[PDB]
Design an enzyme around this catalytic site. Sequence first.
Site, mmCIF file in Angstrom:
data_model
loop_
_atom_site.group_PDB
_atom_site.id
_atom_site.type_symbol
_atom_site.label_atom_id
_atom_site.label_comp_id
_atom_site.label_asym_id
_atom_site.label_seq_id
_atom_site.Cartn_x
_atom_site.Cartn_y
_atom_site.Cartn_z
ATOM 1 N N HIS B 130 -2.995 -6.444 -2.052
ATOM 2 C CA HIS B 130 -2.328 -5.580 -1.193
ATOM 3 C C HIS B 130 -0.717 -5.764 -1.229
ATOM 4 O O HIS B 130 -0.040 -4.899 -0.786
ATOM 5 C CB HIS B 130 -2.911 -5.793 0.217
ATOM 6 C CG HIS B 130 -4.101 -5.391 0.539
ATOM 7 N ND1 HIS B 130 -4.539 -4.029 0.073
ATOM 8 C CD2 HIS B 130 -5.217 -5.854 1.122
ATOM 9 C CE1 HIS B 130 -5.888 -3.917 0.455
ATOM 10 N NE2 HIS B 130 -6.286 -5.224 1.012
ATOM 11 N N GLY B 138 -2.244 -7.225 4.525
ATOM 12 C CA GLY B 138 -3.577 -7.330 4.235
ATOM 13 C C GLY B 138 -3.917 -8.663 3.857
ATOM 14 O O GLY B 138 -5.063 -8.908 3.045
ATOM 15 N N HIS B 167 -11.575 -3.189 -0.110
ATOM 16 C CA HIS B 167 -10.637 -2.081 0.236
ATOM 17 C C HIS B 167 -9.661 -1.761 -0.959
ATOM 18 O O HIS B 167 -10.034 -2.232 -1.943
ATOM 19 C CB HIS B 167 -9.582 -3.223 1.208
ATOM 20 C CG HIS B 167 -10.000 -3.832 2.402
ATOM 21 N ND1 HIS B 167 -10.645 -5.177 2.222
ATOM 22 C CD2 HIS B 167 -10.171 -3.369 3.763
ATOM 23 C CE1 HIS B 167 -11.196 -5.354 3.503
ATOM 24 N NE2 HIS B 167 -10.709 -4.532 4.594
ATOM 25 N N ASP B 254 -16.131 -8.989 0.084
ATOM 26 C CA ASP B 254 -16.271 -8.489 1.291
ATOM 27 C C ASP B 254 -17.125 -7.337 1.462
ATOM 28 O O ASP B 254 -17.159 -6.264 2.357
ATOM 29 C CB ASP B 254 -14.711 -8.194 2.093
ATOM 30 C CG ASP B 254 -13.769 -7.585 1.247
ATOM 31 O OD1 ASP B 254 -13.903 -7.265 -0.243
ATOM 32 O OD2 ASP B 254 -12.591 -7.585 1.624
HETATM 33 K K LIG Z 1 -11.430 -2.039 -4.430
HETATM 34 ZN ZN LIG Z 2 -10.724 -6.812 0.789
#
Ligand SMILES: [K+]
Ligand SMILES: [Zn+2]
Lengths: 4, 364
Positions: B130, B138, B167, B254
């Site tokens: 990030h 992040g 993410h 995650d």
């Molecule tokens: K990703």
């Molecule tokens: Zn993540």
Amino acid sequence: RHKK
Amino acid sequence: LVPVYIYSPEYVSMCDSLAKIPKRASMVHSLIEAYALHKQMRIVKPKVASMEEMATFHTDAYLQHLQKVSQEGDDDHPDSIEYGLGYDCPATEGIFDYAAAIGGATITAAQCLIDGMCKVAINWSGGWHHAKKDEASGFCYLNDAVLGILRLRRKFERILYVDLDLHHGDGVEDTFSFTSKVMTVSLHKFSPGFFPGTGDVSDVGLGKGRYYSVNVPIQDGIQDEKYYQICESVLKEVYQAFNPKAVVLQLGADTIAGDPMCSFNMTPVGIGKCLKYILQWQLATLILGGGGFNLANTARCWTYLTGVILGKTLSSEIPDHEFFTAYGPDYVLEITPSCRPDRNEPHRIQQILNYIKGNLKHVV
Ligand SMILES: [K+]
Ligand SMILES: [Zn+2]
Ligand SMILES: *Nc1ccc2c(C)cc(=O)oc2c1
Ligand SMILES: [K+]
Ligand SMILES: [Mg+2]
């Protein structure tokens, strides 16, 4: 800006 | 040949200090060690990144600021909000040394691939995708993924970055948005209010880099089979069109059932199939971690994936080790998906896949  | 495993006790100890994931590095390595997988790899000590190495991507202003607030852990600095330091990325004591250590580790891994020391180099404590040139974001203070890609490009003309974290891999995508020499592919949850907010299927990069960014927006509840169908579909088309010379693969856990973020519903077997697909390309491959906030499950996942890299079948019983009591109530390696709905509708997934396929047609 978002918070993670 | 034999994969490189980036590790030292000092490095793990440093990685353990990040407050959003305390002790996770130790749990990951301890489980890998409990399965004796480290004995099947070439253990390489990570170098710390020099200021010049870090400044290949990050601005001097940002680096100096990080170094400044790192001295006394100044979390009340007037410039910190401008530099992305706050709730997600607190200015903790020693944070600069932490960031230098992770940046250095991924650079070290990249260098092993350049030197032909291995075809696969692993840094499970990396993948902080990030961070921007001048901004923490992040939980990421320094973008080791970018640093690794910038090192790899000294040798490899086209580099494919594949990002399987929950993410959007925004920091890496934005960095390379304007070039056709690095293609980024991110599968992630995409929903209003969900961090970082970017990465719709229509986001394809800019200028010379137009169509060299690929985004696959996914909804809550996706499980192994559907995820693999999507990932294989995309990567098949990408490999065909882009013909990468090397791959950087971010495997943030995650996405895994049991994560407190409770969004995707994956198991490491599903991620492992995606990994196998990439490994059969036989290209220089830099393996990175990322998010993952159920610490035992993240260890389960990356341990299993290390077994996949080594072509080994691991025992389902978690061996006794320092963190054994964290593996209840089942004490097995496998993770069972939750009983909640998959919010991904077949027609929308198909539309996304059609759109991406159309985009890649321009890639030649
Ligand atoms: K990703
Ligand atoms: Zn993540
Ligand atoms: N972005 C994000 C989401 C959730 C968080 C918790 C539960 C704790 C924390 O310290 O930081 C968080 C950040
Ligand atoms: K690009
Ligand atoms: Mg509907």
